Design a protein around this ligand. Structure first.
Ligand code: HEM
Length: 398
């Protein structure tokens, strides 16, 4: 399972961390990754797992590498074709500017109460049941319905669209990754063509009618962009909301704090994004490069885990402790550098709206008795399931 050590890599830097199956997973996924930050582990290591690749383990190095796109390229962002995820500057700036017209802060401010109405109807349908699988019953339906809202798409298309995106990250075997992607494209293409002719004020209409390098955007470019806008906000949001609700279910004192001080909910959102950070992307070396005393070779892959920066004790004191009143919350949960999450403003509103509406309607809830919560590790780390229970008599319809 281990790849043989390339000759340019010294043995003393070898630490065989498996990002898809870390040894301490049962202690919780963030904890399992933080093994990389023990005092005997150098800031830059090589693992022989998953083809062999570098891992930067400290916030300083993670930030620096994400800044230096000239040495650390996005052409190969995964260990071991959406736009703009695979492009370096300067072509990236064009598509990034266009995508920002659909998910940027002004759009998020316009949709805030639509987001709230969606959260309310979901929670209200669960409230009288006294139980749910949060991941399945709230976290999954929420971001897909936000996308249908953004893209002006009908409710009846959800089951099939949801299935297609599920096949890309959690295949049941019906479809290869390529087949799911093309089916997704089969779906988007006619909508794009039609909204070239009769535009609305939706995200597909904007992307379809956009300009890159003097002339109109192609259908190939529009489809691969709309595709990323869809998938970019699903798994991250589903899994992040799950880590957050797991913690709040296990910490009645933190629940109480936000119940008593609702004005702290946006700071709490930021501290949860630090503690339960979940993305680990990477880059490929464009050339030989000596980085902080270490010889990196052209073509080497390097994992730069966005998750690790906020957990670094050099960045935040007592990093495993959740403290909604931290003066300085330092993290790279949405990334850093030219590819910084375009959905970051939408995500923060999704999180804040969720916490406000859930705590308003179902203030007291616990993990279902006897349930053990299981985490999973990957490019986007997550929660397998979150069985929650409450007493309907302690809830309120609002
Ligand atoms: C908690 C939720 C989210 C997290 C943790 C997150 C995290 C990230 C990270 C780390 C990146 C950069 C990856 C890299 O540099 O290789 C990224 C990029 C991106 N995200 Fe998110 N994201 C979230 C929500 C969303 C949402 C809601 C959307 C849209 C609906 C979205 C759309 C995008 C897009 C389009 C990019 C590509 C930016 C570029 O390459 O220029 N994200 N996200």
């Amino acid at each position: 399972n281990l790849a043989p050590l390339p000759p340019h890599v010294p043995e003393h830097l070898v630490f065989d961390f498996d990002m898809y199956n870390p040894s301490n997973l049962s202690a919780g996924v963030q904890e399992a990754w933080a093994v990389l930050q023990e005092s005997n582990v150098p800031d830059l290591v090589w693992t022989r797992c998953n083809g062999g690749h570098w891992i930067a383990t400290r916030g300083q190095l993670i930030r620096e590498a994400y800044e230096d796109y000239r040495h650390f390229s996005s052409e190969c962002p995964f260990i071991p074709d959406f736009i703009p995820t695979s492009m370096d500057p300067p072509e990236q700036r064009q598509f990034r500017a266009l995508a920002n017209q659909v998910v940027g802060m002004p759009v998020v401010d316009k949709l805030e109460n639509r987001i709230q109405e969606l959260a309310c109807s979901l929670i209200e349908s669960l409230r009288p049941q006294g139980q749910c699988n949060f991941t399945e019953d709230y976290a999954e339906p929420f971001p897909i319905r936000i996308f249908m809202l953004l893209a002006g798409l009908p409710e009846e298309d959800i089951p099939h669209l949801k299935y297609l995106t599920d096949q890309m990250t959690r295949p049941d075997g019906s479809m290869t990754f390529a087949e799911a992607k093309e089916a997704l494209y089969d779906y988007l293409i006619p909508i794009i063509e039609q909204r070239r002719q009769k535009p609305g004020t939706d995200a597909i209409s904007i992307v379809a009618n956009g300009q890159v390098n003097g002339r109109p955007i192609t259908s190939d470019e529009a489809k691969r962009m709309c595709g990323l806008l869809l998938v970019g906000g699903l798994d991250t949001v589903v899994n992040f909301l799950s880590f957050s609700m797991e913690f709040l279910a296990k910490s009645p004192e933190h629940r109480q704090e936000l119940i008593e001080r609702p004005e702290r909910i946006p700071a709490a959102c930021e501290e949860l994004l630090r503690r339960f950070s979940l993305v680990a992307d990477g880059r490929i070396l464009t050339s030989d490069y000596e980085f902080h005393g270490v010889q990196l070779k052209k073509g080497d892959q390097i994992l730069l885990p966005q998750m690790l920066s906020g957990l670094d004790e050099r960045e935040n004191a007592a990093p495993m402790h959740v403290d909604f009143s931290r003066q300085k919350v330092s993290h790279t949960t949405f990334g850093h550098g030219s590819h910084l999450c375009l959905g970051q403003h939408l995500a923060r509103r999704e999180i804040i709206v969720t916490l406000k509406e859930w705590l308003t309607r179902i203030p007291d809830f616990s993990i279902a008795p006897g349930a053990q919560i299981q985490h999973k590790s990957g490019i986007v780390s997550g929660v397998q399931a979150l069985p929650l229970v409450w007493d309907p008599a302690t809830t309120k319809a609002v």
